[PDB]
Protein backbone atom coordinates (compact mmCIF):
# COMPACT_ATOMS: atom_id res chain seq x y z
CA UNK A 1 0.00 0.00 0.00
CA UNK A 2 2.67 2.60 0.87
CA UNK A 3 4.50 1.53 -2.34
CA UNK A 4 1.20 1.97 -4.26
CA UNK A 5 0.53 5.51 -3.04
CA UNK A 6 4.15 6.35 -3.86
CA UNK A 7 4.45 5.02 -7.40
CA UNK A 8 1.20 6.84 -8.19
CA UNK A 9 2.80 10.08 -7.04
CA UNK A 10 6.11 9.24 -8.69
CA UNK A 11 7.52 10.59 -11.92
CA UNK A 12 8.25 7.14 -13.33
CA UNK A 13 5.73 5.77 -15.83
CA UNK A 14 6.50 2.17 -14.84
CA UNK A 15 5.85 3.03 -11.24
CA UNK A 16 2.75 5.04 -12.13
CA UNK A 17 1.28 2.30 -14.30
CA UNK A 18 1.84 -0.68 -11.95
CA UNK A 19 0.32 1.24 -9.04
CA UNK A 20 -2.80 2.28 -10.94
CA UNK A 21 -3.24 -1.29 -12.23
CA UNK A 22 -2.87 -2.43 -8.64
CA UNK A 23 -5.38 0.13 -7.36
CA UNK A 24 -7.70 -0.82 -10.16
CA UNK A 25 -7.33 -4.45 -9.25
CA UNK A 26 -7.86 -3.39 -5.63
CA UNK A 27 -11.07 -1.61 -6.63
CA UNK A 28 -12.03 -4.30 -9.19
CA UNK A 29 -12.92 -6.92 -6.56
CA UNK A 30 -16.49 -8.29 -6.47
CA UNK A 31 -17.18 -8.48 -2.72
CA UNK A 32 -17.21 -5.05 -1.00
CA UNK A 33 -14.41 -3.23 -2.85
CA UNK A 34 -12.25 -1.03 -0.61
CA UNK A 35 -13.54 2.18 -2.17
CA UNK A 36 -13.43 4.34 1.00
CA UNK A 37 -9.86 3.16 1.49
CA UNK A 38 -8.60 3.97 -2.06
CA UNK A 39 -9.94 7.55 -1.78
CA UNK A 40 -8.37 8.30 1.63
CA UNK A 41 -5.01 7.20 0.11
CA UNK A 42 -5.13 10.45 -1.90
CA UNK A 43 -4.57 8.99 -5.37
CA UNK A 44 -8.00 9.94 -6.70
CA UNK A 45 -6.80 13.43 -7.79
CA UNK A 46 -3.69 11.81 -9.27
CA UNK A 47 -5.91 9.30 -11.15
CA UNK A 48 -7.76 12.24 -12.72
CA UNK A 49 -4.38 13.65 -13.92
CA UNK A 50 -3.46 10.32 -15.59
CA UNK A 51 -6.65 10.59 -17.66
CA UNK A 52 -5.04 13.46 -19.56
CA UNK A 53 -1.88 11.48 -20.45
CA UNK A 54 -2.74 10.95 -24.13
CA UNK A 55 0.75 9.54 -24.74
CA UNK A 56 0.03 6.81 -22.22
CA UNK A 57 -3.30 5.28 -23.30
CA UNK A 58 -2.79 2.26 -21.05
CA UNK A 59 -2.44 4.43 -17.95
CA UNK A 60 -5.47 6.43 -19.08
CA UNK A 61 -7.48 3.22 -19.45
CA UNK A 62 -6.40 1.80 -16.10
CA UNK A 63 -6.96 5.17 -14.38
CA UNK A 64 -10.43 5.50 -15.93
CA UNK A 65 -11.23 2.01 -14.76
CA UNK A 66 -10.20 2.65 -11.12
CA UNK A 67 -12.11 5.92 -11.20
CA UNK A 68 -15.16 4.07 -12.55
CA UNK A 69 -14.99 1.50 -9.76
CA UNK A 70 -14.74 4.34 -7.26
CA UNK A 71 -17.82 6.05 -8.73
CA UNK A 72 -19.78 2.79 -8.45
CA UNK A 73 -19.62 3.22 -4.70
CA UNK A 74 -21.70 5.38 -2.38
CA UNK A 75 -23.11 8.75 -3.29
CA UNK A 76 -20.08 10.33 -1.58
CA UNK A 77 -17.61 8.27 -3.52
CA UNK A 78 -19.28 9.55 -6.66
CA UNK A 79 -19.33 13.17 -5.32
CA UNK A 80 -15.55 13.03 -4.74
CA UNK A 81 -14.86 12.07 -8.36
CA UNK A 82 -17.13 14.84 -9.59
CA UNK A 83 -15.44 17.38 -7.30
CA UNK A 84 -12.05 16.54 -8.74
CA UNK A 85 -13.26 17.56 -12.16
CA UNK A 86 -13.46 14.15 -13.83
CA UNK A 87 -16.79 14.78 -15.57
CA UNK A 88 -15.58 16.99 -18.45
CA UNK A 89 -12.45 14.87 -18.79
CA UNK A 90 -14.41 11.65 -19.30
CA UNK A 91 -16.53 13.45 -21.89
CA UNK A 92 -13.32 14.58 -23.62
CA UNK A 93 -12.15 10.95 -23.42
CA UNK A 94 -15.12 9.96 -25.55
CA UNK A 95 -13.05 11.43 -28.36
CA UNK A 96 -10.09 9.22 -27.47
CA UNK A 97 -8.07 7.57 -30.24
CA UNK A 98 -8.09 4.46 -28.04
CA UNK A 99 -11.17 2.20 -28.07
CA UNK A 100 -10.55 0.91 -24.53
CA UNK A 101 -10.41 4.44 -23.19
CA UNK A 102 -13.65 5.50 -24.96
CA UNK A 103 -15.52 2.43 -23.71
CA UNK A 104 -14.30 3.10 -20.16
CA UNK A 105 -15.22 6.82 -20.28
CA UNK A 106 -18.76 5.73 -21.24
CA UNK A 107 -18.96 3.27 -18.32
CA UNK A 108 -17.60 5.98 -15.99
CA UNK A 109 -20.10 8.61 -17.14
CA UNK A 110 -22.89 6.10 -16.78
CA UNK A 111 -21.90 5.52 -13.17
CA UNK A 112 -21.81 9.23 -12.32
CA UNK A 113 -25.11 9.84 -14.09
CA UNK A 114 -26.66 6.79 -12.43
CA UNK A 115 -26.02 8.22 -8.99
CA UNK A 116 -28.87 10.80 -8.95
CA UNK A 117 -30.87 13.28 -11.11
CA UNK A 118 -28.48 15.93 -9.83
CA UNK A 119 -25.47 13.99 -11.16
CA UNK A 120 -27.33 13.01 -14.30
CA UNK A 121 -28.04 16.68 -15.11
CA UNK A 122 -24.37 17.70 -14.60
CA UNK A 123 -23.11 14.95 -16.89
CA UNK A 124 -25.61 16.12 -19.51
CA UNK A 125 -24.57 19.72 -18.85
CA UNK A 126 -20.91 18.91 -19.57
CA UNK A 127 -22.13 17.93 -23.00
CA UNK A 128 -21.84 14.17 -22.67
CA UNK A 129 -24.84 13.22 -24.78
CA UNK A 130 -23.59 14.38 -28.15
CA UNK A 131 -20.09 12.85 -28.06
CA UNK A 132 -21.78 9.67 -26.79
CA UNK A 133 -24.18 9.27 -29.74
CA UNK A 134 -21.29 9.75 -32.17
CA UNK A 135 -19.68 6.54 -30.86
CA UNK A 136 -22.59 4.65 -32.27
CA UNK A 137 -22.45 3.45 -35.89
CA UNK A 138 -22.48 0.35 -38.10
CA UNK A 139 -19.08 -0.80 -36.82
CA UNK A 140 -19.49 -0.27 -33.05
CA UNK A 141 -18.38 -3.44 -31.25
CA UNK A 142 -20.91 -5.21 -28.97
CA UNK A 143 -19.10 -4.34 -25.75
CA UNK A 144 -19.39 -0.65 -26.58
CA UNK A 145 -23.07 -0.98 -27.60
CA UNK A 146 -23.88 -2.49 -24.25
CA UNK A 147 -21.87 0.21 -22.49
CA UNK A 148 -23.28 3.08 -24.48
CA UNK A 149 -26.90 1.97 -24.16
CA UNK A 150 -26.68 1.30 -20.46
CA UNK A 151 -25.25 4.80 -20.20
CA UNK A 152 -27.93 6.33 -22.45
CA UNK A 153 -30.61 4.70 -20.28
CA UNK A 154 -29.14 6.28 -17.11
CA UNK A 155 -29.05 9.74 -18.76
CA UNK A 156 -32.78 9.31 -19.12
CA UNK A 157 -33.54 7.65 -15.78
CA UNK A 158 -34.74 9.50 -12.71
CA UNK A 159 -37.40 11.62 -11.02
CA UNK A 160 -37.81 14.43 -11.77
CA UNK A 161 -37.21 13.58 -15.42
CA UNK A 162 -34.54 15.44 -17.38
CA UNK A 163 -35.58 18.12 -19.86
CA UNK A 164 -37.01 16.40 -22.86
CA UNK A 165 -35.03 18.79 -25.04
CA UNK A 166 -31.84 17.42 -23.44
CA UNK A 167 -32.65 13.73 -24.02
CA UNK A 168 -34.34 14.11 -27.40
CA UNK A 169 -31.28 13.62 -29.62
CA UNK A 170 -30.82 10.15 -28.10
CA UNK A 171 -34.07 9.01 -29.70
CA UNK A 172 -32.73 8.06 -33.17
CA UNK A 173 -30.01 5.91 -31.54
CA UNK A 174 -32.40 4.16 -29.15
CA UNK A 175 -34.80 3.54 -32.06
CA UNK A 176 -32.03 1.66 -33.88
CA UNK A 177 -30.84 -0.12 -30.78
CA UNK A 178 -34.18 -1.88 -30.18
CA UNK A 179 -33.51 -3.70 -33.46
CA UNK A 180 -30.55 -5.48 -31.85
CA UNK A 181 -31.03 -9.08 -30.75
CA UNK A 182 -28.74 -8.65 -27.76
CA UNK A 183 -30.77 -8.92 -24.57
CA UNK A 184 -28.67 -6.47 -22.61
CA UNK A 185 -28.89 -3.77 -25.26
CA UNK A 186 -32.60 -4.51 -25.70
CA UNK A 187 -33.06 -4.35 -21.92
CA UNK A 188 -31.43 -0.93 -21.46
CA UNK A 189 -32.85 0.56 -24.65
CA UNK A 190 -36.43 -0.26 -23.62
CA UNK A 191 -35.88 1.06 -20.12
CA UNK A 192 -34.44 4.16 -21.81
CA UNK A 193 -37.52 4.48 -24.05
CA UNK A 194 -39.88 3.79 -21.13
CA UNK A 195 -38.50 6.96 -19.51
CA UNK A 196 -38.90 9.16 -22.59
CA UNK A 197 -42.51 8.15 -23.36
CA UNK A 198 -43.44 8.87 -19.75
CA UNK A 199 -44.93 12.36 -19.73
CA UNK A 200 -47.09 14.53 -21.94
CA UNK A 201 -48.45 13.36 -25.29
CA UNK A 202 -45.94 15.48 -27.23
CA UNK A 203 -43.18 13.38 -25.68
CA UNK A 204 -45.11 10.29 -26.85
CA UNK A 205 -45.42 12.11 -30.16
CA UNK A 206 -41.63 12.29 -30.42
CA UNK A 207 -41.24 8.61 -29.55
CA UNK A 208 -43.68 7.14 -32.10
CA UNK A 209 -42.39 9.53 -34.72
CA UNK A 210 -38.97 7.97 -34.19
CA UNK A 211 -40.52 4.74 -35.46
CA UNK A 212 -40.22 2.41 -32.52
CA UNK A 213 -43.77 1.02 -32.47
CA UNK A 214 -43.47 -2.15 -34.63
CA UNK A 215 -40.34 -3.42 -32.91
CA UNK A 216 -41.73 -2.65 -29.47
CA UNK A 217 -44.75 -4.86 -30.11
CA UNK A 218 -42.38 -7.68 -31.06
CA UNK A 219 -40.51 -7.25 -27.78
CA UNK A 220 -43.75 -8.09 -25.94
CA UNK A 221 -43.10 -11.63 -27.09
CA UNK A 222 -39.44 -11.69 -25.99
CA UNK A 223 -38.85 -14.78 -23.87
CA UNK A 224 -36.84 -12.78 -21.33
CA UNK A 225 -38.77 -10.83 -18.66
CA UNK A 226 -35.81 -8.45 -18.58
CA UNK A 227 -36.76 -7.13 -22.04
CA UNK A 228 -40.55 -7.67 -21.90
CA UNK A 229 -40.88 -5.60 -18.71
CA UNK A 230 -39.42 -2.31 -20.01
CA UNK A 231 -40.96 -2.90 -23.45
CA UNK A 232 -44.40 -3.42 -21.90
CA UNK A 233 -43.85 -0.17 -19.92
CA UNK A 234 -43.03 1.82 -23.04
CA UNK A 235 -45.96 0.42 -25.03
CA UNK A 236 -48.25 1.09 -22.10
CA UNK A 237 -47.03 4.70 -21.96
CA UNK A 238 -47.61 5.20 -25.63
CA UNK A 239 -51.27 4.10 -25.41
CA UNK A 240 -51.93 6.66 -22.61
CA UNK A 241 -51.72 9.22 -25.43
CA UNK A 242 -54.35 10.06 -28.01
CA UNK A 243 -56.30 7.84 -30.39
CA UNK A 244 -53.78 8.25 -33.22
CA UNK A 245 -50.76 7.73 -30.96
CA UNK A 246 -52.55 4.67 -29.54
CA UNK A 247 -53.21 3.53 -33.10
CA UNK A 248 -49.46 3.27 -33.96
CA UNK A 249 -49.35 0.44 -31.48
CA UNK A 250 -52.64 -1.24 -32.40
CA UNK A 251 -51.58 -1.24 -36.04
CA UNK A 252 -48.86 -3.81 -35.36
CA UNK A 253 -50.99 -6.52 -33.81
CA UNK A 254 -50.20 -5.69 -30.19
CA UNK A 255 -53.66 -6.74 -28.97
CA UNK A 256 -53.11 -10.39 -29.89
CA UNK A 257 -49.73 -10.09 -28.14
CA UNK A 258 -51.14 -8.62 -24.92
CA UNK A 259 -53.74 -11.27 -25.06
CA UNK A 260 -51.06 -13.95 -24.79
CA UNK A 261 -49.41 -12.13 -21.86
CA UNK A 262 -52.55 -12.70 -19.79
CA UNK A 263 -52.93 -16.36 -20.83
CA UNK A 264 -49.48 -17.76 -20.26
CA UNK A 265 -48.38 -18.32 -16.69
CA UNK A 266 -46.52 -15.06 -16.02
CA UNK A 267 -45.94 -12.89 -12.92
CA UNK A 268 -48.80 -10.87 -11.42
CA UNK A 269 -46.85 -7.65 -12.08
CA UNK A 270 -46.71 -8.41 -15.78
CA UNK A 271 -50.35 -9.43 -16.10
CA UNK A 272 -51.30 -6.28 -14.17
CA UNK A 273 -49.40 -4.03 -16.61
CA UNK A 274 -50.87 -5.65 -19.72
CA UNK A 275 -54.33 -4.92 -18.28
CA UNK A 276 -53.50 -1.31 -17.50
CA UNK A 277 -52.22 -1.12 -21.09
CA UNK A 278 -55.39 -2.84 -22.33
CA UNK A 279 -57.43 -0.32 -20.24
CA UNK A 280 -55.87 2.62 -22.11
CA UNK A 281 -56.94 1.09 -25.40
CA UNK A 282 -60.59 0.51 -24.43
CA UNK A 283 -60.16 4.09 -23.19
CA UNK A 284 -59.98 4.82 -26.93
CA UNK A 285 -62.51 5.03 -29.78
CA UNK A 286 -65.21 2.57 -30.90
CA UNK A 287 -62.79 0.96 -33.34
CA UNK A 288 -59.90 0.62 -30.91
CA UNK A 289 -62.43 -1.01 -28.62
CA UNK A 290 -63.44 -3.06 -31.66
CA UNK A 291 -59.77 -3.97 -32.14
CA UNK A 292 -59.74 -5.37 -28.58
CA UNK A 293 -63.01 -7.20 -29.03
CA UNK A 294 -61.68 -8.69 -32.27
CA UNK A 295 -58.52 -10.06 -30.66
CA UNK A 296 -60.72 -11.95 -28.20
CA UNK A 297 -59.50 -10.13 -25.10
CA UNK A 298 -62.91 -9.60 -23.43
CA UNK A 299 -63.38 -13.30 -22.73
CA UNK A 300 -60.16 -13.69 -20.74
CA UNK A 301 -60.57 -10.17 -19.34
CA UNK A 302 -63.85 -11.03 -17.63
CA UNK A 303 -62.30 -14.16 -16.12
CA UNK A 304 -59.57 -12.02 -14.56
CA UNK A 305 -62.10 -9.47 -13.22
CA UNK A 306 -63.91 -12.40 -11.63
CA UNK A 307 -61.14 -14.67 -10.36
CA UNK A 308 -57.74 -12.98 -10.47
CA UNK A 309 -55.63 -11.37 -7.74
CA UNK A 310 -56.84 -7.88 -6.66
CA UNK A 311 -53.90 -5.98 -8.23
CA UNK A 312 -55.15 -7.42 -11.56
CA UNK A 313 -58.90 -7.11 -10.80
CA UNK A 314 -58.30 -3.36 -10.31
CA UNK A 315 -56.94 -2.94 -13.88
CA UNK A 316 -59.42 -5.37 -15.53
CA UNK A 317 -62.26 -3.25 -14.08
CA UNK A 318 -60.84 -0.13 -15.66
CA UNK A 319 -60.49 -1.91 -18.99
CA UNK A 320 -64.08 -3.21 -18.86
CA UNK A 321 -65.56 0.00 -17.51
CA UNK A 322 -63.73 2.26 -20.00
CA UNK A 323 -65.09 0.09 -22.80
CA UNK A 324 -68.66 0.83 -21.66
CA UNK A 325 -67.82 4.52 -21.65
CA UNK A 326 -66.78 4.88 -25.29
CA UNK A 327 -68.50 1.86 -26.79
CA UNK A 328 -71.59 1.54 -28.94
CA UNK A 329 -74.94 0.02 -27.96
CA UNK A 330 -73.98 -3.32 -29.58
CA UNK A 331 -70.38 -3.53 -28.33
CA UNK A 332 -71.74 -2.96 -24.85
CA UNK A 333 -74.25 -5.81 -25.24
CA UNK A 334 -71.30 -7.96 -26.30
CA UNK A 335 -69.51 -7.07 -23.04
CA UNK A 336 -72.63 -8.18 -21.15
CA UNK A 337 -73.02 -11.31 -23.28
CA UNK A 338 -69.44 -12.19 -22.27
CA UNK A 339 -70.78 -11.89 -18.74
CA UNK A 340 -69.28 -8.72 -17.30
CA UNK A 341 -72.30 -7.75 -15.20
CA UNK A 342 -71.62 -10.23 -12.34
CA UNK A 343 -67.82 -9.56 -12.06
CA UNK A 344 -68.50 -5.80 -12.01
CA UNK A 345 -71.15 -6.14 -9.27
CA UNK A 346 -68.86 -8.27 -7.08
CA UNK A 347 -66.30 -5.47 -6.80
CA UNK A 348 -68.82 -2.91 -5.47
CA UNK A 349 -67.80 -4.20 -2.06
CA UNK A 350 -64.03 -3.94 -2.55
CA UNK A 351 -62.06 -1.84 -0.01
CA UNK A 352 -60.57 0.32 -2.77
CA UNK A 353 -62.81 3.38 -3.02
CA UNK A 354 -61.68 4.38 -6.51
CA UNK A 355 -62.48 0.98 -7.90
CA UNK A 356 -66.01 1.00 -6.52
CA UNK A 357 -66.64 4.26 -8.42
CA UNK A 358 -65.27 2.71 -11.64
CA UNK A 359 -67.47 -0.37 -11.44
CA UNK A 360 -70.46 1.77 -10.49
CA UNK A 361 -69.79 4.02 -13.49
CA UNK A 362 -69.41 0.99 -15.76
CA UNK A 363 -72.62 -0.52 -14.41
CA UNK A 364 -74.52 2.76 -15.14
CA UNK A 365 -73.46 2.80 -18.80
CA UNK A 366 -74.81 -0.76 -19.07
CA UNK A 367 -78.01 0.52 -17.48
CA UNK A 368 -78.49 3.28 -20.09
CA UNK A 369 -78.24 0.80 -22.98
CA UNK A 370 -80.71 -1.54 -21.34
CA UNK A 371 -82.94 1.50 -21.00
CA UNK A 372 -82.78 2.12 -24.73
CA UNK A 373 -83.64 -1.52 -25.44
CA UNK A 374 -86.63 -1.21 -23.08
CA UNK A 375 -88.00 1.67 -25.16
CA UNK A 376 -87.20 0.07 -28.55
CA UNK A 377 -89.09 -3.05 -27.43
CA UNK A 378 -91.71 -0.95 -25.60
CA UNK A 379 -91.09 -3.31 -22.69
CA UNK A 380 -92.08 -3.33 -19.03
CA UNK A 381 -88.65 -3.92 -17.44
CA UNK A 382 -85.01 -3.04 -18.18
CA UNK A 383 -83.44 -6.43 -18.89
CA UNK A 384 -80.03 -5.35 -17.61
CA UNK A 385 -81.45 -4.19 -14.28
CA UNK A 386 -82.72 -7.69 -13.81
CA UNK A 387 -79.22 -9.05 -14.40
CA UNK A 388 -77.67 -6.53 -11.97
CA UNK A 389 -80.41 -7.39 -9.52
CA UNK A 390 -79.64 -11.07 -10.12
CA UNK A 391 -75.89 -10.65 -9.46
CA UNK A 392 -76.70 -9.38 -5.95
CA UNK A 393 -75.71 -6.06 -7.38
CA UNK A 394 -78.93 -4.33 -6.53
CA UNK A 395 -78.34 -5.01 -2.81
CA UNK A 396 -74.74 -3.78 -2.97
CA UNK A 397 -75.82 -0.51 -4.55
CA UNK A 398 -78.69 -0.18 -2.05
CA UNK A 399 -76.02 -0.55 0.66
CA UNK A 400 -73.78 2.04 -1.03
CA UNK A 401 -76.39 4.61 0.07
CA UNK A 402 -74.68 4.01 3.42
CA UNK A 403 -71.17 4.70 2.15
CA UNK A 404 -69.02 7.36 3.82
CA UNK A 405 -67.79 8.83 0.52
CA UNK A 406 -69.87 11.45 -1.31
CA UNK A 407 -68.80 10.44 -4.78
CA UNK A 408 -69.93 6.86 -4.11
CA UNK A 409 -72.94 8.05 -2.11
CA UNK A 410 -74.31 10.38 -4.78
CA UNK A 411 -73.86 7.84 -7.62
CA UNK A 412 -75.71 4.99 -5.87
CA UNK A 413 -78.61 7.34 -5.24
CA UNK A 414 -78.46 8.57 -8.86
CA UNK A 415 -78.50 4.97 -10.13
CA UNK A 416 -81.33 3.76 -7.90
CA UNK A 417 -83.36 6.89 -8.61
CA UNK A 418 -82.92 6.59 -12.39
CA UNK A 419 -83.49 2.83 -12.59
CA UNK A 420 -85.18 1.66 -9.34
CA UNK A 421 -88.13 3.96 -8.49
Amino acid sequence: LPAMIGGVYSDDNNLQLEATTQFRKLLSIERSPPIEEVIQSGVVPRFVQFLTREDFPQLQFEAAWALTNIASGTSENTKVVIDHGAVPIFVKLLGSSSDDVREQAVWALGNVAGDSPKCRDLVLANGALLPLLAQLNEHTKLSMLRNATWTLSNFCRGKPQPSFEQTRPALPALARLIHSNDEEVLTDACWALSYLSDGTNDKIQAVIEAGVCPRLVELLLHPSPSVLIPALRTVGNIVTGDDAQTQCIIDHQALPCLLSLLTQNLKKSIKKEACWTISNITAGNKDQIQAVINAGIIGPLVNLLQTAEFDIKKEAAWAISNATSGGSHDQIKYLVSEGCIKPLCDLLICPDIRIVTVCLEGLENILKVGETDKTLAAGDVNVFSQMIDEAEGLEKIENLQSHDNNEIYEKAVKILEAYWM
Binding site: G241, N280, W318, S321, N322, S325, E407
Partner: peptide, 7 residues
Protein backbone atom coordinates in the same frame (compact mmCIF):
# COMPACT_ATOMS: atom_id res chain seq x y z
CA UNK B 1 -65.87 11.70 -15.39
CA UNK B 2 -64.09 8.91 -13.50
CA UNK B 3 -63.37 6.73 -16.54
CA UNK B 4 -60.77 7.51 -19.21
CA UNK B 5 -57.04 7.45 -19.90
CA UNK B 6 -54.49 7.03 -17.08
CA UNK B 7 -50.85 8.01 -17.01
Amino acid sequence: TVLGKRK
